[PDB]
């Protein structure tokens, strides 16, 4: 018996804490991973504000994946107002969200690189990551209007059209990204399969195992019809932590059908590519494998896109003040939900968000259990935690 | 040169904008030594073991020469305020990075009412509690504007940084800064560059004057920083 | 007091393409540079100030030669050309952008390049910065009163306007020409112009104006190396007809007189504001 | 003992608010001689005759003890500026009557583009050009608040007028004063009095905190003047 | 430091009407004053704090006795009662208005009465100002965690809540009683209460609270003439049972303790803010 507390945990986004009941041997028997970041309360100060302000504001949840929140926001508002964005606006919107994920996944492999990438390979490894992030940020900047916080993501579609020249330049930039990805995959997959860090430490085989399911609505975008929100229920931290730790959690405890559920790249690969490998390493592997799916999808969007087609709908932003619109999007880190009720004037009556990591935090608490505590942070980082997102 | 990235109630967008220097970032990271950044390094780890507990803490190191502080401070959170006074004491130059830290930014709209910390509702820029030496507006400020700050700070280009040092004394930002200080004072000539600077597209040129859509402004302060009728240092007139 | 700021060389010039001279205001330097850049891969987009049938202006990102021609000529009203500078490098996808503006608009462009807080990816895509001379500007309804009430011509009938020989000129679609003494326009000019310390667009790559050169020609100031390469490429290709200012009349002396007249008059206005307590740039 | 009502770029609503003291206006006018008010009295008349024209002009008199100045100053109108500087030199106590005079108010939104004076676009409170002694916010301030200003001014009740003399030093008001000074600074307790003060019903209590509908705020400053967590002088604690 | 501010007399009291006692929190002083005023022409409207099925509050202008009874009882959550003070004078047309609120809300009243910039026609119509004692308050979601997560009762099943004897209490619709130590509630209280320097609502015409009096009674501080006339009219009409605080226990001493401890604790917060640079009232 002994208690181990790691605070703050490192090399991910945000501010969290680990609380680990451990035995005399280092093995964690009860785990608790929780956010302690101060809550800004976006959803609550959006009440009364016009609908158009929502994607602007929720984008500031997080600067690593702001596109994920602007997308879910406009999808929820559109659903509440029965607005249908045009063919080409919806294509541009998905292309924007892909470009953002094309920069987050290589970014995450850069954050974990101190553990797995040898010292002599570091500079070459980082140059490759930055070369990939450059292309991903180029896509968000050209389609979304800004690389960090995109103003073109609006209720109705996408605000601006790209030129035939920007489209061609993007396509050949994606071909470059695809070559960088095959080079990066070739390099990382063997290391994750080795289960050995760069200092020689062999990680346990069952590192990160948990008995929870997955949620994912789409391999690259999102589909509100692949989930029944009525079955999503947010519980309090007292349902998963002890009392003295539960009063420290800044997030809620989201469930589906009455159980915790993991979201992210492994969830998607489980639902669409039959990837059923458990553990921490398998998460890293799914995220690496996904880089290829993203860039291929982007080039397929460029082939179908008509740069002259309508991108913004003319339908007005009015609601009935009652319907609970639903907007889901597969953020880099997983299924991301926003909800909105819009009145006849186009103002926000009610707003709520259930962010990706928020699903993952209570799973991580149970996933660190069973292994030595000096492996806990390696399990945490496998989930690519974004705490500003989880807390908002 | 010891550099540190301190993260308070922000979103990491300003850090990502620093990362969007790509090739210049490798240059920048070998000229200075990043001693603290919870998102990037494992510093500074300190362990304290009793008979019942093992406390592995990551504290802010000392000797910090330049500290890029991102985000605002939550007055109802003890850790948040402990860390903003900490960064000031342990750093010689404190840079308010981004609108959240420099002027409040989007967190000005925080009013609370949301679990799970229902009491969190009061957010202020770091300048309201500690001394700020340089301030970068924007949400986020561009990577190019970032490398210029970092280069000038290392080259002692005090003439270039004067506009941001003066900006560190002011803790309030809004789109009405264009009206109060330019339109109302008979200084606006209608160039339109303030509209081109806005990240949310909240400014609209009508009748040759900027028109701020108030419900879209996030109080980032990029437009008032850009206006050449507010500040126009002579160093800009020097071109090759 | 420095009259013209810094520059490399000054020359009297006019475009070689005769279609350009038929639509331009003076020598057609702004259009000739824009068109030459677009046709020879030096510019892929250029900012212009277009007009409607009633002379109301609109900043626009042009990509064709015809867009440049339709934007030729001077509109003596405020047009915010720098308001589209980010759009040009965003949806338009420009990477060799041409910029045109009055001195205060060039000043704003150097400001945003030195401190590009909200101008990510913008400064390094500015390929040519063309400034035009300017003494005053006007609100639209200011010009509308000058044209319709003082010159007696409807805006829809205006083909061209011009300032010169101490008079304001209105040329009609139907051949008429009417002129009024420049003194009758002063109460209509944008007051914020009375603190401007820049007459020849002293911060541009290339500056052009009508004063100092005869009718159909332009006094042109080469200033930066970026404007030097661009200008020398044009004269080599023969796109311009250049004569030294020493040979042309009225000559550079007029430009020095008008420039220092503006700097001296408005300097009293700046000191006047400082005296009563009004803010001035610094 | 010599009150003057100066009218610059206002609407006369504040003067009507004074007239709505009714029975109490006839005690003010017999306690004090009204020496200038273009809307009320024909002073001060002078006749200037040259070879061409006879000019019957009404000038602001000398020896004004209290000057109630209503409305903002247009920097593009010579007469407007001439009158604000005239009223200062000829009055010992200058009072900024209403939001237009005190902080700009609705006239902050002016930007021009409207015949027949197409150049008029720059409107500033009087405090931006002359030293102001007392400032009454609101649009318009109530008649009750007006009689308290005048009674206290004649009785030398400096303790009461202290809050308005402090206001005269500031020239910028808005609905955002409530957020930046009370909500963000962990002082707001949710009394709701600020919502009850707003003349435009632009404040809406949500989660026990005022929510400002910015598209409705006219920047009169009545809410920030009311907030007891900003200014609560001890004089208010003495009750009968 | 003065404990209770200025007052004329202090008694222990309780409503004579038994139906009021069935629905009120302590002695029913607020409800008895409102009901007496409405029924005898001393009030035509009274501000109350109502609740819904889930305990969420809403400030309301009440004009009937049944509206007063339904608003009886303490809701330990922020309710901006002063936000409807102009509404009552305007649409409701009241001219003898009764106001109720915590000390800070009584302060907000006196402030708007002394400096009524945005309160035309409002101050002269305030006929009775009733303050209630207050040590702390809570945001709604703060109280929701306390009841549902610390006491284990749904808000929809809460019939009454009370603070007393070092504990917070929840009474259920179905007869259950749950209670916790007050140390479990401190993290959830409105942090802006930590600068409050007023416990017994020192600026009211009449103040009332539970401290100092036994269960079912209230400590009542009469302070102004207006509350003296009203109170005296009530006792004459027999609307109240009055006992001296000198015979009842615990007694005024407990009130002087709590009031001072609070002023001593929160004055330290004010000095803390002053030193670190945060603003405080003055
Ligand atoms: C308000 C104003 C005042 C001026 N005052 C003087 C002066 O005192 N002395 C002098 O020598 N020259 C002055 N000029 C410049 C002059 O009128 C000519 O426009 C200049 O010489 C360029 O003409 P060009 O024939 O060489 O090129 P052109 O082929 O005629 O093209 C002119 C270009 O200028 C741009 N333009 C037109 N109107 C505006 C506007 N309102 N704002 C911004 N851009 C515009 C158009 O996009 C166009 O492409 C002034 C120009 C303006 C707009
Ligand atoms: C947050 C809070 C903390 C308190 N703390 C203390 C304390 O430490 N010691 C103490 O002696 N007393 C305290 N009180 C007051 C006490 O609990 C009783 O409310 C008081 O004695 C009045 O009850 P009553 O039976 O006399 O009148 P009642 O007949 O019960 O009517 C009470 C009146 O108060 C109004 N009211 C109810 N809730 C609120 C609210 N949240 N805000 C404003 N008005 C409201 C209702 O409109 C109602 O008309 C507190 C009250 C509140 C709201
Ligand atoms: N990816 C991602 Fe977010 Ni920063 C998380 N977690 C949001 O939608
Ligand atoms: S200023 Fe903008 S980008 Fe920077 S931390 Fe704040 S919200 Fe994020
Ligand atoms: S940048 Fe300044 S001067 Fe130019 S249009 Fe905007 S407010 Fe006016
Ligand atoms: S108008 Fe735009 S640039 Fe200016 S403060 Fe508001 S959001 Fe920032
Ligand atoms: S006079 Fe100066 S401020 Fe006015 S338009 Fe010309 S360059 Fe701009
Ligand atoms: S403050 Fe209001 S009432 Fe007074 S002059 Fe201005 S607009 Fe009119
Ligand atoms: S919110 Fe209301 S009271 Fe406050 S400044 Fe705006 S209009 Fe005036
Ligand atoms: S008056 Fe002040 S303390 Fe009261 S609700 Fe308004 S802002 Fe908050
Ligand atoms: S403790 Fe003070 S500030 Fe808090 S609710 Fe009670 S009276 Fe108001």
Author numbering:
A (entry chain J): 2 to 393
B (entry chain L), D (entry chain I): 2 to 241
C (entry chain K), E (entry chain H): 1 to 282
Quote the study on this structure.
FRHs catalyze the reversible H2 oxidation coupled to the reduction of coenzyme F420 (8‐hydroxy‐5‐deazaflavin, ΔG°′ = −10 kJ mol−1). The overall reaction requires three components: the large subunit (FRHA) that harbors the [NiFe] center and oxidizes H2, and the small subunit (FRHG), which contains three [4Fe–4S] clusters to transfer electrons to the flavin adenine dinucleotide (FAD) located in the F420‐reducing module (FRHB, harboring an additional [4Fe–4S] cluster). Here, by characterizing the native hydrogenase from the marine methanogen Methanothermococcus thermolithotrophicus (belonging to the Methanococcales order), we provided an unprecedented functional understanding of this enzyme via a synergistic approach of biochemistry, X‐ray crystallography, and spectroscopy.
Despite its sequence conservation with the two other structural homologs, we found that the [NiFe]‐containing FRH from M. thermolithotrophicus (MtFRH) exhibits a dynamic equilibrium between a dodecameric and dimeric state in solution, as highlighted by size exclusion chromatography and native polyacrylamide gel electrophoresis (PAGE). It was therefore not surprising to observe several crystalline forms containing either a dodecameric cubic organization (MtFRHcube) or only a single FRH dimer (MtFRHdimer1 −3). Surface analyses through bioinformatics confirmed that the dodecameric state might be less stable in solution based on the structure of M. barkeri (MbFRH). However, considering the molecular crowding effect and the naturally high FRH expression (≈1% of total cytoplasmic protein), we propose that MtFRH forms a dodecamer of ≈1.2 MDa in vivo. The dodecameric assembly has been hypothesized to provide stability, protect redox centers, or keep the metal clusters at optimal distances. Nevertheless, the comparison of Fe‐containing MtFRHdimer2 and Fe‐depleted MtFRHcube does not reveal any structural rearrangement of the surrounding residues or the ones in the vicinity of the [NiFe] site. Therefore, the importance of the additional Fe site in modulating the redox properties of the [NiFe] center remains to be experimentally investigated.
